Each structure stands twice: as C-alpha cells, then as structure tokens.
Amino acid sequence: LDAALRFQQEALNLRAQRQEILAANIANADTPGYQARDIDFASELKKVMVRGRVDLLYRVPDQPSLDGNTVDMDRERTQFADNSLKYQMGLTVLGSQLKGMMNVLQ
Amino acid sequence: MSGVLEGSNVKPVEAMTDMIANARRFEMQMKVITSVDENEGRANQLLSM
C-alpha cells in the first residue's frame, strides 16, 4: 500500500503548479496581448487521482485594455494569496499524516 | 477687394477659455493617476506571507 498519502501529495503538487501559473500571470501582467491563464484545481485533482501523472484554460476577462492584455491584477492577487494559503494547508495536512504514521510506529 | 489685407481669424476669447479648460482637465487627470498609483501600492501587500 502506502498510497494513503497520494491524495494530498498530488494536491500539493497541483498547488505548486498553480503557483507557477499565477506567478507567470503576474510577470506577464504588462506584455501586450497575454490572455491570462489558469487551471481548475478541483477537476485537475480528480483527473490526476483517477489516472495519475493539465489544460491551461483562459481566465475569462473583464475590463478590456487595447493592448490585448487580460491579466486583471486584482483577481490574480486574490487567487495567488488563496493558492499560497492552500499550499501551506496541504503542507500541514501531509505533515500531520506523516507525523501520525511515524508516531504509531515507534 | 483690393488695397486690403486679411489677418488671422484666431478668436482670443475661445483660445483663453480653451487653455484654462486644458489646464484644469490636466490636473484632474493627474489626481486620477495619483490615486491609481497609490491604490496599486496598497494592493501589492496582498501577496505576502
């Protein structure tokens, strides 16, 4: 066995990937015609649980800009904060499972 | 009509009011720019921790 950590491990990996995506968003917040992207965390987590080892959907824009850029910075800031917090949560949950598994053991 | 020259039709009163309007419009835009800058400054603290 020892696939009892699989769910949170894959969730934490997808959280890291989403962090990378959102950092790319922030970085390209000025390049003309960027068409900000994102991924759907729930659907991708379910997809990686059912099969194992991610389509880049387009964040639906508000507020056009004539440079084609659609990174609306406020949404990206909120989503980046949410993703960082969820990543830290996943760290704590995995830590608790490993603490428990090594507490029962010795 | 000979013996006569013709000058410029630059109405000075509309030019004066246009310049006053331009100055005031410019400084309203400057206030908008200042507020937007300082907003982005405040907001860039969400990403910490």
Side-chain angles (χ1 to χ4, degrees):
Chain A
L1 312 159
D2 220 335
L5 318 172
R6 168 182 202 57
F7 175 68
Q8 300 287 356
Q9 179 171 359
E10 302 302 321
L12 175 76
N13 189 179
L14 264 295
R15 284 297 182 189
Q17 285 196 12
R18 201 163 178 264
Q19 274 286 111
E20 281 206 18
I21 298 313
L22 294 172
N25 276 16
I26 305 300
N28 308 311
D30 291 331
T31 74
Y34 176 67
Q35 269 280 3
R37 314 288 269 286
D38 205 333
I39 69 180
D40 187 89
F41 183 69
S43 64
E44 289 281 343
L45 183 41
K46 293 192 286 288
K47 186 173 187 291
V48 65
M49 278 295 268
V50 299
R51 68 171 185 86
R53 305 266 180 246
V54 57
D55 51 355
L56 263 177
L57 318 167
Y58 292 77
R59 181 82 59 73
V60 65
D62 56 348
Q63 273 183 319
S65 73
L66 294 175
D67 59 354
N69 188 332
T70 69
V71 174
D72 188 291
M73 191 56 108
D74 312 314
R75 294 290 174 88
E76 307 304 331
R77 300 169 204 234
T78 46
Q79 299 274 9
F80 185 84
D82 179 19
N83 214 44
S84 79
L85 190 152
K86 293 265 194 49
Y87 181 100
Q88 310 209 24
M89 191 180 157
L91 278 188
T92 295
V93 167
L94 265 175
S96 68
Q97 305 199 25
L98 285 167
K99 292 289 186 181
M101 178 64 169
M102 206 159 165
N103 272 282
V104 176
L105 187 61
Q106 63 92 22
Chain B
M1 192 155 258
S2 168
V4 179
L5 260 183
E6 181 175 78
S8 72
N9 56 2
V10 181
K11 295 180 181 179
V13 60
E14 68 97 11
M16 190 76 47
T17 59
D18 265 14
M19 293 182 286
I20 281 171
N22 287 352
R24 309 276 90 80
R25 174 164 59 239
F26 191 96
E27 48 187 0
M28 281 155 28
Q29 313 311 146
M30 281 315 128
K31 176 165 174 63
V32 168
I33 285 176
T34 290
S35 179
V36 182
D37 184 13
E38 191 277 332
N39 277 354
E40 291 265 291
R42 264 152 210 181
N44 279 335
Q45 311 272 60
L46 294 175
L47 311 159
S48 79
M49 321 305 148

